[PDB]
Every structure is written in C-alpha cells, then in structure tokens.
Design an enzyme around this catalytic site. Structure first.
Site, PDB file in Angstrom:
ATOM      1  N   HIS A   2      -4.327  -1.840  -1.541  1.00 48.38           N
ATOM      2  CA  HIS A   2      -5.545  -2.142  -0.815  1.00 48.38           C
ATOM      3  C   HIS A   2      -6.025  -0.876  -0.132  1.00 48.38           C
ATOM      4  CE1 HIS A   2      -3.420  -2.248   3.123  1.00 48.38           C
ATOM      5  NE2 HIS A   2      -2.428  -2.677   2.364  1.00 48.38           N
ATOM      6  N   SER A  49       0.810  -1.212   0.000  1.00 47.25           N
ATOM      7  CA  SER A  49       0.000   0.000   0.000  1.00 47.25           C
ATOM      8  C   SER A  49       0.848   1.268   0.000  1.00 47.25           C
ATOM      9  CB  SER A  49      -0.925  -0.016   1.212  1.00 47.25           C
ATOM     10  OG  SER A  49      -0.195  -0.280   2.395  1.00 47.25           O
TER      11      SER A  49
END
EC number: 3.4.21.92
Lengths: 222, 193, 338, 174, 217, 187, 148, 133, 179, 172
Positions: G67, G42
């Site tokens: 995500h 991320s």
C-alpha cells in the site's frame, strides 16, 4: 460561553430559531443523526400543515450525516407539497450534499464560498465472513441509492458519478453549478472572484499559461 | 461558567440585538456561525435599510463557519459595519476586514491578528493530497479576499500572513484592515517643561 | 584468539569495529551513550577512523512531539568537534534536525548516504511554557534564539552556506534526498548499490525469460503509449495558449497610445533602445515560430468537418452591448467601433 | 440579585477575567452607555486577574463611555482588577479599607517553533510597554518606577495604593 | 571468532540440564504453545523450529506441540490477531523433518483446533476434559468503501478455504463438508465428540485416573 | 550512579560494593520498602561480623513506623553505628541522623541541610477509633522526642516546643544544637 | 555463509524502514535469500523485494500486501503542503523501487498503490515481488547451508 | 586520578547541584569539569565546583544561573518557616558562586533573581569556567 | 412544531428506543386515544433498534388503541422499529421509497453463576419466539420462514418488505424506489 | 411527568434508589392531599432497586387514602415486582406482553466479623419481611414463595394472574 440568542422582540419574545421556523426557515447544522432527521422531518411536516402551498427555505451548514437519516430527510423533502428551497452555507460534506441537491429544481442555492463534497458511502467491515458480506451489501445498497439520487437530481451519468465520487470530491459553487447540484450561486454585491480550482481548469485548457496567468490567483506554486 | 452570568449576558445580548448589534465572541465554531447567520437573516427581514453593527471579539474560529458568516454579511441588504473590541484574531480578523468598506472600526487598544489556516491532513498519500488541497484552497481564498479588502497585493498579504502577524489598530488602518479608530477626546496633560 | 571471546551481542560486535550507531531519537540517554563511545574510541587511538551510522529523527519525533531539547544535539556535535580522529558519517534512512547536523558534521569528503535516505532540517521548537510572566517569556525566547543560532552555526560549518540562507531555508521543513543533500552540502557521496549484484540481477531478468513474457511487454507498451499521448496533449495545450496570445496581438495591433513614449522615457539612457536585462524579465518570442519543419508530417486526420464561418470583418462600427464611462476611447482608423 | 444592581448602573467585575466574562462586561458597559449618556457607571472589582486582551477590551469599553466610570475594590484586585481599577475616572476610584491591590506585569506564554516563540514574546513585550505607559499615566509616576514595581507581584493596602496613585478614596477613610 | 556450533542432546547430555524450564522443554523437543498466536509466539516458534531442524542427526525424533491457546481470536469472539500468524507457525512447523505430534491441555480453539488436527494421524493427544472448538475466521474492524470490505471478505474466504483444506486432510472428509461442519458456525467439541470426528486420536499416553488406580491397587 | 565498580576481583554493583565495606547508603525517603531493605541489610551486616556500620544518608523525609523500625534495628545489632549526612537529612532522616553513634560519630557535609519535625500521621473512622489512633500518635511523638532529647542533650520540654513546626539547621547550628558532632571537610 | 537468509513475516511498519532495509540489502556484497512466511506488508514487501533476484521465496500460504505510504501531519497551511509534497515523493520512491524489483512500469505500480493490494503466492510470483514457491527442500538446504 | 566530569544538564533542583558540588570538593585530587551543550543551575553549580584552572566549556555551551524554586503549603507560620529556608538556600548558592567567580555576592544575588544565560565566553568571564575547548 | 403535529395525531418515534422513551410514547398514545376514539393516529418510526422490553411496551400501547394506528417509516427501522412498523393496522402501514428495513434478533449476555446464565438464555429465547409469533401473523408468512428470516442480518428496501408482508404502501408510488 | 402527574399517574420507572423513592413519596403524599377518594394509578417499569427505598414506597402506598392501582408496563423485577404486587386488591394490572420477575435481596457489606454478621442478619430480616408480605399479597404459602424468591423466577402476566401478583390484563 455556549451561545447567546436574540429574541426578535414581539409581544411574546420567543427564541430566535422558533421565530425563524415560524417564518418557514429550517436550519440544518451539525451531523444529521437520528434526532436531527426527526427534527427536520417534523419541522417540514408542521410547516406543511400550517400552509401546504408556500415555500420552505432550508439552510444547510453541516459536516455530514448518518446516511439513513439523510435518506429519510431527502424522502421527506421530496414527499411534501410546498416548494423546498435549499441554500448551502459554510460546508455541506457529502451526505448533507444530497440535501442540497434535493431542493426544488431551480431553487437550489449555494453561497459563493461554500464547500460541497461528494464521497462514496463510507462504512466499515468487522467480524465473521457473513458480517463482512452484510457490510458489503449495506455499502453497495447505499452506493446505489445515493448514486441514483445524484443521477436523479443532477442528470449526470452513473459513470460521471463514478468519477465524481471515487474519492472525496471537494467542489466550489461553480463546479456544483456546472454539474447540476445547485442552480444559482448567491454572490456578494458583484463578487465574481474565480476560485483556485477554476483557475486550474483555465490552465488545463490553455487559456492561461505560466507566462500570462491573467488576473487570477497564482497557482504556479502547486 | 456561572448560570447567573449566562442569564445576565443573555439579557444584555437581547438588548443589544434590539439595538441592531449582533456580536461574534469566542472561537467561531459551527454553532456560533449558524446562530449569527440566523441573527443576520432576522435583522435583514426586520429592516432592509438601517445599518447592522457587528461586534467582533474573537480569538479564532473555523474557516468554514467564518465563511458562512462572511457570505451572509456580504449577501444581506443592510450594511454590516464590523467593529473590533479586544481581539479580532485569525477569523474575527477576516470578519472585521470584510465589514462594509469605510465602516470597519476598532477601539484603540485592540489587537488584529491575521494568519493562514491551521489544520491537519491524515491518511494515505492521496487523502493527504486531497486535504492539503482543501487547506491550500482556503488559504488562497482568504488571502485573495484580504488583498481585495486592504488594497494590498496578494503576494504582500501571503508574505505577511505566513506566521502570526499581530497589529495595533493604527497599523491596521495604515494597512487597510480597519478604517477608523473609535475614541473620545481625553484631557491633554500639561507638562511643566 | 580464544583469549578475546566472540562479542556477546550486536552492539558490542559493531562498536568493536569503531562503528558508532546513532539510531534513536536524540534523548539524554542516547546522547550520553554517544559521548561515552566517542571518547572511548578516541582513547583507543586518535588516528583510527570512526564510522557513524545515522538513522535518527533528531530531538523530536517526526510527529512533532518534542522529546529532548535543542542542547542534546549541541552536546553531540561539540563532542564530534572535540574528538580529533576522522569521522565518516553515513546517513541511513532518516537524519532529521540535529541528526542532520551530525551527518553534515563528519569529516568532509567522508559524509555519505544510502541512495534513498532522507535528510530533513527544520527550526527547533519548545514545549509550552505554561503562562509565565512577560520577562520570563522574553528570557525563554532569548534561550531559544541562542540555541537556534548554535544550530545555525554548526550547520554552517557542516554545509558551507551562509547563516542567513540557512535561517531562511529552515523556517519550514526542508526535505533532501541524497541528490539534494549532495547539492546543498550535507553529504559528499552516495553509496551506490553493488555493481555485481545489479549486473547479475539484469542478467537473470533477461536470461530467465521473465522480463519478456509475464505480462510485462503489453503494459510497458501501454506505458509508453500513455506517455506519448500525454506529451502530445500537453503540446496541444501549449499550441492553444500560443494561439490565444497571437489573437491578443492580432487584436492589439489596432492601437493609438502615447504610453509607449512614457515607457521609453522611464527606462534608462542605455536602454533607450530595446535592450533586456538578463533576468526573469524575460520576453519569450512566439512570432519567430517559423519552424518550417517538413519532417513532422500531419497524421491522417480530417479537420475538413469544421464548418465555414460567416467570415466577419472587424472594420465595422457595431459594438458589443457593454458599459464604459471613458470617452477617450476614440474610434481607431482600423477600428471605427474601437 | 446582580441584575437589580445593573438597574442602578453597577457592573460587577468579579471572578477571573476571561473571554466570556470580559465579553459580558463589555456588553453591559455598551448597553449602559446607550441607555443614558450622563449617569455614572460603577464597576465593582473583585478578581485575581485574567487575560491581557480581555483586560484591555474592558479597559477600552471603560474609556469609550461618555459617563464617568467610578471603580470600587472589594477584597482583591490583582493584575487586571488593579489595572482596570486605576483606569476609572480620576478622583472617582474608591477601595474598601481592607482590600488587597496587586500590581503585576502581564502574563503570557509561548509554544511551538522559534518563530512562534519570537512572535509571542514580541506581543507580550508590546503589552508590557503599553500597560506600563497607561499605569504611569494614571498613577502619575515615572515609567521607570512602574517598571520596578510591576517587576514582581506587589501587594498594596489601600493606603499604599492611594499614595502610589491607583485609588483616590478609601471608603472607611482611616 | 570461531564458529560456535550448538551441540545437541546425544553429545550435550554431558553438559548437564538446562537452567530454566523453557530450555528444558526445547531440549525435550516439546514446543509448548501456551499463549494466543501473537506475533511474539510466532517469532518464538519459528526460532524453535529453526533450532530443532538445525542439527538433528536423525530428525525422526518427533516434535511435540502442546496447545493451550484460543488461536487468533480473543475470548469474547473478536479476533485478537490475524490468520497470517497461524500460517507462519504452520509453515514453520512444516519445514522441519520430524513427525509433528500435537496435544491439547485445556483449550485448543479456532486456530489451535486446526493445528491440533494437523498433527500426525494416530498421534494427537488431549486431556480428557480439553475443550475443542471450531469457529469461522474473524477480521478486525477496518474502515473504508465497499471495496475495502469486499477485499477483506476475499481475504477471509482464502483463510476459510485454507482451514477447510487442512481439516479435510486431517479428518478425512469432503472439503466443502469440512467447511460446513466446522468453519460455518462456532461449534464445540468434547474430547469424545472431537475423537468421533477425527479432531483428536488419543488421550495423552499413560493417563490413568486416581480412583481407577486405587481400584487396580 | 549505576556503574558497577570493580571489587577484589570482579565487577560488583556500586551499592553492593559499598555494603561489602559496611557502608550503608540510604538515599530515598523511608517508605516500608526502603526501610525493610535497610533493616535487612543492617541485620546481615551485623551477622558477618561486628566492626561498625557507617550510614550515609540523603534522606528527604519519610514515614514514622518504618523509620522507628530501622532505628530499633540499628540499636539492636552488636556492631556500633555512625551516621554521616551527604546532601540532606529531613524529618525522620534528621531523626536517623540522631540514631547512630551518640559518642561523636554523627558527621555532615558542609552544605548539608538538616530538619526535624514532629512525626505526622492521618487516620479516621469511628469516634473511638480516632481516640485510639490519636493516643498512639501522641505516644509516638513523645517517644521520638525522648529519643531526640537524649540524642542531642536538649531538654525534653524544649524539644517538644521546638519541633512542633519545622526546624531547619545549617551544620554550624546543628553542632551548636547538639544534633551532630563533626562536619566533614577535605581531610 | 556467503548468503544472508532473511525470514519475513510482518504486518507493517513505516515505509521508510522498508526503504532502509531494501537499500541495505542491495548494498551488502553478499547475496540474500528472503523468505516470506504468512504475510509481508508494506515494509516487509519492500524487504522481500530487496533480496537477490532469483532467491526471493514465498510459501504457498503467504500473502503480500503493498500500500502507498500513509502519513499524518498537523500545522499551518504551508506545513501541510510541504509534508504533503514529501509524502507524494515517498510514494514515488516506493513505486520506483517496486518497478525496478518487479520490472513492471511505475504507472501500473502507482495504479496498484492507489488502494491496499493483497497478492497470493501465485499472484506475488507472477507480479514479480517473489521468485519461487518455498517448498520444504528449499530451507532444508538453507538450514544445511547455515550448518555447512 | 582526577575525576573528569562531563556536564550536559538542562535542569535539575538546585539543592542537588549543591550536593554534587560538595561531593566534588570532598575528594582531594583535583576535578576537571567539561561542559557540553548546556549546564543549567544544578549543573552550573557542578561546573563551578571543579578545580580552578581546570574547568572547561565548549564554544556551543550555554550556562544557566537562577535562584532555587519551591512549592509550599500549610498554615501561615509554616509558609513563613519554609520561605526562610528557601532564602537560606538562595544565600548559600550565591555564596558558592561568589567563591568560584570572585565577584560581589550581592551582585551575584542580583543576577540570580531571574533566569540568567551566559554564552561560553561569558561563562569564562563570569568565572564559572576557565577555558574553551 | 411537534406540538402542532401531536395535535394532528402524529407521534414521532425517532432515534434509539429506550425505557423512558417508551414510557413517553405510551403516554402520548393513551392521551390521543382518551381524547378522541374515532380518528386515526400516525406513528413515524426512524429508529435503529431499542430494548425488547421497551419495544414490547410500545407495541402493547399500539395494540390497545381503539383509533387505528398507522405507521410511516423513514430512513431506518432496525430490528425493533421494524417490528413496531409491522404492528400498525393492516393496510395502513407506509414507508418512504428509500427507507431501509431490518429484521433481526436481540443480543444479550449473562454473568456469574450459570444459573442466571441459563435463565438469560431462556429469556432471550422467549423474546425470539414472542416477537417472531406476532411478526408471522401480520407478515402473513409461515412461522418457519419468519424464524429463518429474523436470523439473517440484512436490510431490505420497502419494495422487498412490501412483498414480504411487513409494510403495505410506499409513499412515492415506487417511482423513487432505488436498490 | 407533570403531564402524567395531573392524571393521578405516578411513574415507578427504572431501578429504584433513594432519590427516586423520595420523588415517588412526595408525589404520593401530595396526591393524597389533593383528593383522598379519587384513585391513583401507577406505572411500574423497573429492574430492581434498594430494598429500603422499595419498602418506603410500599408503606407510603399502603397508608395513604386513595387506592394505588399498579399497572405494569414492560417489566417488573423483584423489587418493582413486589411494589406491583402490592397495589390495591383487584387493581393490579399488567400489559399483555410485560414480564414479571421475583428474586431475593442483594447488597454488600464490609467490616469486622460482628458488623458484617449484623449486615447478614438484616438481609435475612429483609428476606423474611418480603416473603411474609408476598404471602399476604398472593395467597401462596411461605414455602412456595420462598422457593420462588430463592432463584430467579421469570413469569408471564397470565401466570402471575393465577399466581396472584396481578389481578387482570389490559387487553381491553
């Protein structure tokens, strides 16, 4: 301060839950693990042996269950002779949720303020590629079994179950009665209060607006 | 606790239950609420007319188990008159509110606390939205019910239950949560003046 | 130039350029270091400026776990008040609680932030007392109250806002993006990205032919179509609501009441005529919806499949099978069923 | 053991006053009220104290009864044994000669945001004022004197308690 | 201020020996990987590679990679780290110029076995009692729907095909063959079995046993 | 109290800087570790030359064997010893305060708190093991009491009766009792 | 060195840190060449998308997983609600940043952040988070720039 | 040339406050003591230990004053002895405050009894500090 | 309620099977045999596994019983409940339409001197052979196929098992058998 | 257990300790008090136990009047195996799938050279006594039994039949 029981106070004065089971009432609380499934199936079959034609009433207030134990309980419910009549209380969280739908059609009930839930079978992958493939097949088989049972009881399409189970789906008794999980809602002495989700469904079809929200709970702060 | 204390208390619990007096003590978890639903169903089966007296003395409890007890109170035939002794806090206070209208009582020195549900949301952003909708639905439902019981408005209630709101039974009557105070006459002390 | 060697590491490298980097939860070690550096940078000159970078979560973890106290921030902020040379405080990432006061406590007009940084403000919390007496609970509350008031006063010097407004807003977490912090008073500027970088980026996306054909156009079309479709659906919902209100007014024009005379009576002498009050008592008028727009043409759609109703008249006596114990509900001249 | 004495209308308030313990004592008191309206209930107190809410719950069950509620002290009566000991029927509060009676302002705590702290402090100040009024009502002392004495842990013997008004009899006299 | 340039061995022989041992090995162009492929080892090895291909004049002096690690999987067979730590190391060791000689001291297992094979042909060393072993990649326990576990299976199958590609290039076999022999089940290799299959090529140079030396004396 | 203070030409740690001037700051209760460090420091300081060693004590207590080892090392070295009490000297610290410089070289700060008590100890096992340990601990009490009595000048029998419980002293009581010799003031 | 080379291999980190590194990399005047080795989760995917467009390299064996922000939070109903709204605003911030870095619409980015999302080298370059496969000559030249 | 003591200490054992006060008074060139944020008991003693005329407090700073704390354990006579020393500590702390505030020592003892909070101006008036930053 | 079912010659084997759990069930089966020799027993198996030792104890008890011992699996039967379910009388093994049946090897370990390690490997290998030999006999499938299948980690529906020879009837008439 | 107990069934289940041995000994003595003729049967399922507790159980079994037939269910391991081997001759049964283990004693020691040497030779005493009794019970010589007990000796019920520990199998 664990718990303190009445007795019913007959000439014997036995435990209250033994008295209720003798009067054909099975309580399901807590997770349906293997012991709970064993106890419920044993209770169902003992009540069947006592009288194979008179209704059994099951009260379900449980936060889930192991999927295999729930499938065992639902199989025992569908495979016995008497009418099984399931009242949902408090919560029924997704695996217990099937236990509510598995009552004799027409005799599935939910109390006015319960919270049903529907979820995809949650499991968990770990280890080698073949262990992970085994987990994928286990969770796909569970998804098929629970999806087929929900189709069988509520009549929904497999598409509709796909939308209704793609994420934790918390439902009131009113969504459950619209969908088909339950058959009648046990209300108060004339209690028809509209829950916040149903108010939002009012707003989505234009029945109420921000100007004229009607006599429903204020969901303008969402 | 001591086993002999438990055995004495279970005996007096059986006596009270014989006298149609259920009791809600301690944090109202799922186990206590399943037990109290069972007791209420039994008391409905035994007699469909006589009142049930429900002893509320609780510091809190689960929203869901509290609503299990609350629906069973509002569904059974006999009128469940809730009486508060000691502390009806945050879900025993809701239960005390929901006793049969005109039959909710409180001893003079008790405390009623009504507030909003606690809880927790964990996980990715979407799981947190789903769980925040669960907590907000519980908060809205309980505030709507408190508005129904007390005669207040939903906004006054929502303002009053934002933080912990402790009340004496006098303030509770003047609010609408409780309908009477139970007390016997004392001897009014004459002052020399 | 050899005489001063290159700085041994990065904190020395930054602090050599008068950059006080506050980037850690405001613990007593961090507060002591900040005070030492600010005093030293005043010592080297009290006209040169100080660029303070704030990427910090205040006196408590974002989890809520209390980790210092409400007085480490008072030390740091009173220090910033003590040093007299100008301080420009740039917010990076997170500036929570006292670390927000520090952001709003720099030189006014010099407080800045990156375009996505978040500045949160909430009310102080304390670790559990541990079952003290009654007077010690009262005294602990007076302690906590005095420190909350200190936080409020310093935040009022920072933002510009009254103490009461700030107290009301603080009762719950208040999250502020740089547009929101700039509105509220925390910061004055937002550090926009470099223009030459952005221009070169756009030119590269165009010239390389990546922005056009990598699958972009199909789904940008899908995006615009979804936006238009959802806008139209919401317009239909509004139309449904307005028609419901028009039906309520159609079925409410059959009335005989004297309560309107009472509503005339209660209102003031000036509003004896209908004269609204420039407030959220605001009556939006639907009936003057004679748009008459000849441009917005109905699309090629067929509503001629809707049936032909029975065409009921409401001027009947028949009533729905209901219950009402009121006998003032006389039949109306237009509603003999009432 | 204990049940055999409950058959003689005697309630042991022993051990720390707690939620479960206070619930048990209240239930015993209500039951002994229902069984016979006019026979004395005897409460034996040997407890270092407990929650204020539990203590006032037991105090309410004590005051609600139609039966004279004798109180007795065995050893220690501290911070809620003492309040409930004096809360017995006047003239019917006894104590063992060598028993320690401590008077004590209520204990409470506070945790969380400044509003939680303010609410808990307001509740504890209410309890302190209420308890001071009740104790001065049955000790027949000024409210100021009770404030001074409850300021810090005051231990009295049954003679100091009897002159101070908490008890009415000393079972060994002198 | 001035750009301080790190000077290298030809011109740094006049500045003496390095103080400690890791600086010595770095100077000898030996990258000793003694610890499992944790993010720390990855960072350190990436920095060593960046320093070694930084200012080599000829960058033909080979880089030695001695292994005493069980790779990205713990001793009890459950993954201690992920396969991306290996990729980062492997990728890093490829962005240099010099031939990459690899050796095993005691254990090169499960990822370090692949990295062992991935040295120069003819220049992979081992101690004569090194234990080599190849096992399928392993993920760590994560929770979710059938879709999350399917995603993990896809990731693990990318990792397995990656290792099979490297082992095919090293051992000179069919790709799916190398998948079947090595990565399909946790298999052990002695030094002779590993040499038979192309895992290793030689013992370390100069390895001469003690009684053998005695009998040549 | 970390920052290295500048020395003749460089930055040296505060406590090392002090020991460069023969000053030995003891600031922790005497456990095996601190006692070994201070015994080692005393021996090396006596090794450099023989001038005098000032001990500044802030000891809040400690164990008996390490303290007696430190005492014997102080007495073994050629260079004399003076003990000052910054803060407080409790128990075996109050015994170390009576371990250096009998001739009027024990000082104390004005608000220093002094305490002496008979040495503690604990050990179990067989019956005969407890006999051996108890006899040794009584030997230890007697030795430390002889040392205290000959340091302060109080009767041995008086010390035995006094120190059975805790004994606390203000610097004026400590001068009057003979525990110390002078109280530091602004000079 | 009028470029700042930033080498990426990191399995996560709070998304706010990825936003901070993205903003800083977009703020400095000097260019940026961000190389991904192995993985970029991320925050690392934000730092990888943050470099100068056209010089965001990714190796053949790299994976990029993006995500949605995940958070945890306890307290009263109003506190849960407010933290919920903030986490949604962070999800929108991240979606918009990816949308502007990759030129995909925010709605296709939001659809993808619904679940953990893994991308290979070709998938990452196609998607837009990186711009070129990292071949040996790339940081041959990178090292030579640091040396020249 | 004068020790400039910046003070920000939410707590600490009172005996350590006494020890720092003695260390402060030990050096002859005056000591400046500037309190920031908070100066609790062990640091309130240090703040009162600076040079009268050169002790400063900041507008935000709050001063804590309280009696010492202690845990005791042992026989009845050990408890008696240990109580006697804690009382000696409290008397000494009251004496130090009396020297710095020039206020009745018995009154200072009464104020020590429970936790005592002083704003910056009340710190000035009490006598622990002299001026405001 | 379990008392009435035990009167009806119904024995429940639910949850994890363990040493003490086995001893209890062994005793129940012996009691039901010594009381009544001509009337069948029904054993219900909802169990996620167990110990090989305890499982073989229960299996020996089941094979001793003169009265034909039927088995009725519900929910799970995992690698040791499944073996016992396959050890009911042929033609009188039943399952629910949606039970899950697992066949799989046991785990294990050893430690210290590897003499005990080789002995534990020999004992785990014995358990493998023993279980598989009887499994092959009642499934009526080649021992090689059973040895291969007992390796593979997998659940099966009662339809697959009924084909595979383990169970013989599905209670529900294969009308609620879902995949 | 009571349900079994009235059936003259004594359960030696699980690894033996002193509490389990106390319970077994009390059961056996009570059952001998009830009826000195009619037999006692005793189910063995244990992975081991302390040697002293096993010796206590073995002596209580020996000197009481009813024969203590021992039936092995599941497993009998090196201390429950000795107890199983000590049932009345002709009445030591096994289930067909049970396993039987014999191996040497175990236990730790701490103290001086003298004390831990004393613990060492008491362990030697246990080993000698157990081997002598096993030689009495099986019929094999001290040498074969010592070799067997020396290393973990796992056995099948049938082998134990021809090796003397058991008398028969319950396939009946």
């Amino acid at each position: 301060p664990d718990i303190q029981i009445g007795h019913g106070e007959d000439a014997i004065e036995m435990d209250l839950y033994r008295y209720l089971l003798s009067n054909r009432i099975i309580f399901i609380g807590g997770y349906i693990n293997d012991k709970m499934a064993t106890q419920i199936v044993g209770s169902l079959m003992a009540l069947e042996a006592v009288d194979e034609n008179e209704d059994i009433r099951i009260y379900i207030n449980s936060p889930g269950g192991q999927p295999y134990s729930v499938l065992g309980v639902v199989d025992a419910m569908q495979s016995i002779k008497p009418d099984v009549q399931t009242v949902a209380l408090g919560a029924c969280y997704s695996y217990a949720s099937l236990v509510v739908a598995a009552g004799t059609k027409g005799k599935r009930y939910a109390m006015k303020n319960t919270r049903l839930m529907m979820t995809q079978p949650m499991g968990g992958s770990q280890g080698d590629i073949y262990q992970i493939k085994a987990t994928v097949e286990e969770l796909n088989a569970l998804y098929q079994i629970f999806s087929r049972y929900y189709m069988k009881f509520t009549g929904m399409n497999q598409d509709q179950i796909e939308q209704a189970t793609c994420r934790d789906h918390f439902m009131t008794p009113e969504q459950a009665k619209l969908e088909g999980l339950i058959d009648e809602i046990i209300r108060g002495k004339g209690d028809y209060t509209v829950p916040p989700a149903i108010v939002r469904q009012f707003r989505e079809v234009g029945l109420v607006d921000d100007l004229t929200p009607g006599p429903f709970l204020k969901v303008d702060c969402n | 606790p001591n086993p002999l204390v438990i055995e004495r208390f279970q005996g007096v619990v059986s006596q009270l239950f014989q006298q149609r007096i259920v009791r809600l003590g301690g944090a109202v978890d799922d186990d206590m609420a399943n037990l109290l639903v069972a007791q209420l169903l039994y008391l409905d089966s035994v007699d469909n007319k006589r009142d049930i007296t429900m002893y509320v003395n609780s510091p809190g409890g689960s929203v869901t188990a509290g609503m299990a007890v609350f629906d069973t109170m509002r569904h059974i035939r006999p009128d469940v008159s809730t009486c508060c002794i000691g502390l009806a806090a945050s879900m025993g206070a809701f239960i005390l509110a929901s006793g049969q209208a005109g039959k909710r009582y409180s001893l003079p020195n008790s405390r009623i606390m009504i507030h909003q549900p606690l809880g927790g949301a964990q996980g990715q952003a979407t799981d947190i939205e789903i769980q925040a909708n669960e907590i907000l639905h519980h908060k809205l439902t309980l505030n709507g019910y408190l508005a129904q019981f007390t005669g207040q408005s939903m906004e006054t209630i929502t303002k009053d239950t934002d933080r912990d709101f402790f009340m004496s039974p006098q303030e509770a009557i003047e609010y609408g949560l409780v309908d009477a105070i139970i007390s016997k006459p004392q001897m009014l002390q004459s002052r020399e003046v | 130039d050899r005489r001063k060697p290159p700085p041994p590491d990065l904190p020395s490298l930054l602090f050599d350029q008068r950059i006080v980097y506050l980037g850690m939860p405001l613990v007593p070690a961090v507060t002591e270091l900040m005070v030492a550096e600010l005093l030293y940078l005043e010592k080297q000159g009290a006209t040169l400026p100080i660029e303070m970078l704030i990427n910090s979560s205040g006196t408590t973890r974002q989890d809520g776990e209390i980790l210092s106290f409400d007085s480490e921030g008072v030390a740091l902020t009173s220090t910033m008040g003590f040093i007299k040379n100008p301080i420009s405080t740039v917010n990076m990432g997170l500036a929570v609680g006292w670390s927000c006061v520090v952001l709003s406590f720099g030189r006014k007009g010099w407080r800045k932030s990156l375009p996505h940084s978040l500045a949160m403000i909430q009310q102080p919390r304390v670790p559990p007392t541990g079952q003290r007496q009654a007077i010690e609970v009262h005294i602990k509350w007076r302690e906590v109250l005095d420190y909350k008031r200190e936080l409020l006063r310093m935040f009022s010097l920072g933002t510009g806002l009254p103490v009461d407004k700030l107290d009301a807003d603080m009762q719950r977490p208040l999250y502020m993006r740089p547009q929101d912090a700039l509105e509220y008073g925390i910061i004055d500027e937002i550090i926009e990205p470099n223009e030459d970088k952005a221009e070169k980026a756009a030119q590269y996306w165009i010239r390389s032919g990546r922005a056009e054909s990598e699958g972009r156009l199909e789904q940008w079309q899908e995006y615009l179509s979804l936006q238009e479709e959802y806008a139209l659906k919401d317009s239909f919902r509004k139309v449904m609501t307005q028609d419901l209100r028009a039906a309520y007014r159609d079925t409410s024009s059959k009335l005989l009441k004297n309560s309107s005379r009472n509503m005339e009576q209660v209102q003031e002498f000036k509003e004896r005529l209908p004269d609204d009050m420039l407030t959220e008592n605001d009556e939006v008028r639907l009936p003057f919806s004679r748009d008459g727009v000849k441009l917005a043409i109905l699309n090629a759609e067929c509503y001629a499949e809707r049936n032909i109703a029975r065409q009921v008249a409401a001027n009947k006596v028949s009533v729905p099978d209901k219950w009402r114990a009121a006998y003032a509900a006389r039949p109306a001249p237009a509603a003999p069923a009432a | 053991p204990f049940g055999l004495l409950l058959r003689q209308r005697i309630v042991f308030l022993g051990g720390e006053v707690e939620d479960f313990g206070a619930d048990a004592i209240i239930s015993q008191l209500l039951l002994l009220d229902s069984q016979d309206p006019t026979k004395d209930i005897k409460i034996f107190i040997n407890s270092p104290g407990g929650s204020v809410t539990a203590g006032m719950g037991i105090y309410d069950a004590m005051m609600l009864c139609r039966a004279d509620v004798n109180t007795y002290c065995f050893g220690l009566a501290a911070s809620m044994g003492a309040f409930l000991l004096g809360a017995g029927k006047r003239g019917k509060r006894n104590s063992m000669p060598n028993s320690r009676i401590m008077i004590h302002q209520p204990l409470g705590g506070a945790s969380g945001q400044a509003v939680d702290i303010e609410i808990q402090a307001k509740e504890i100040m209410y309890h302190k004022a209420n308890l001071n009024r009740i104790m001065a009502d049955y000790c027949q002392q000024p409210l100021s004197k009770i404030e001074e004495d409850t300021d810090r842990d005051r231990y009295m013997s049954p003679l100091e308690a009897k002159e101070y008004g908490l008890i009415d009899h000393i079972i060994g006299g002198e | 201020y001035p750009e301080g340039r790190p000077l290298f061995l030809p011109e740094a022989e006049r500045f003496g020996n390095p103080p400690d041992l890791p600086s010595l090995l770095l100077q000898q162009r030996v990258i000793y990987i003694s610890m499992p492929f944790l993010p720390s080892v990855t960072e350190l090895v990436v920095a060593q590679c960046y320093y070694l291909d930084f200012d080599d004049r000829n960058r033909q002096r080979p880089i030695y990679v001695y292994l005493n690690s069980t790779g990205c999987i713990n001793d009890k067979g459950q993954a201690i780290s992920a396969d991306n730590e290996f990729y980062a190391i492997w990728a890093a060791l490829g962005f240099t110029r010099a031939p990459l000689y690899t050796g095993v001291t005691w254990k090169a297992q499960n990822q370090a076995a692949v990295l062992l094979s991935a040295g120069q042909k003819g220049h992979r060393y081992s101690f004569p009692h090194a234990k080599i072993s190849t096992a399928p990649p392993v993920m760590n326990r994560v929770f979710g729907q059938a879709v999350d576990a399917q995603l993990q299976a896809n990731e693990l199958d990318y990792a397995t095909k990656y290792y099979a590609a490297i082992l095919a290039r090293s051992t000179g076999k069919d790709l799916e063959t190398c998948q079947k022999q090595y990565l399909s089940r946790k298999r052990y290799f002695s030094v002779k079995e590993a040499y038979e299959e192309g895992l290793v090529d030689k013992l370390v140079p100069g390895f001469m046993l003690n009684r053998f030396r005695k009998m040549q004396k | 109290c970390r920052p290295p203070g500048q020395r003749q030409s460089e930055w040296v740690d505060l406590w090392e800087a002090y020991t460069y001037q023969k000053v030995v700051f003891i600031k922790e209760a005497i456990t095996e570790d601190v006692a070994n460090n201070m015994i080692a420091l005393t021996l090396y300081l006596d090794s450099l030359d023989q001038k005098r060693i000032y001990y500044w004590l802030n000891v809040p207590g400690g164990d008996v064997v390490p303290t007696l080892a430190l005492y014997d090392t102080m007495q073994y070295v050629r260079s004399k010893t003076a003990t000052v009490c910054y803060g407080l000297c409790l128990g075996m610290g109050g015994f170390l305060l009576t371990a250096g410089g009998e001739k009027g070289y024990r000082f104390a700060m004005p608000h220093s708190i002094l305490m002496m008590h008979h040495p503690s100890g604990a050990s179990r096992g067989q019956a005969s093991e407890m006999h051996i340990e108890s006899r040794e601990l009584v030997r230890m009490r007697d030795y430390l009491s002889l040392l205290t009595s000959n340091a302060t000048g109080q009767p041995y029998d008086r010390v035995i009766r006094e120190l059975s419980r805790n004994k606390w002293m203000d610097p004026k009581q400590a001068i009057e009792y003979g525990m110390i010799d002078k109280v530091l003031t602004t000079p | 060195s009028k470029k700042v080379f930033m080498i990426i291999n990191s399995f996560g980190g709070s998304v706010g840190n990825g936003i901070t590194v993205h903003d800083a990399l977009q703020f400095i005047k000097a260019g940026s060449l961000t190389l991904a080795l192995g993985v970029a989760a991320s925050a690392a995917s934000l730092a990888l998308a943050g470099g100068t467009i056209g010089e965001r390299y990714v190796t053949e064996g790299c994976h990029t997983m993006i995500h949605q922000p995940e958070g945890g939070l306890n307290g009263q109903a109003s506190d849960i609600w407010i933290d919920s709204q903030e986490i949604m605003k962070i999800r929108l911030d991240v979606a918009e940043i990816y949308s502007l870095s990759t030129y995909r619409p925010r709605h296709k980015i939001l659809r993808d952040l619904d679940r953990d999302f893994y991308l290979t080298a070709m998938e990452t370059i196609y998607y837009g988070l990186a711009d070129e496969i990292a071949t040996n000559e790339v940081m041959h030249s990178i090292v030579e720039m640091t040396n020249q």
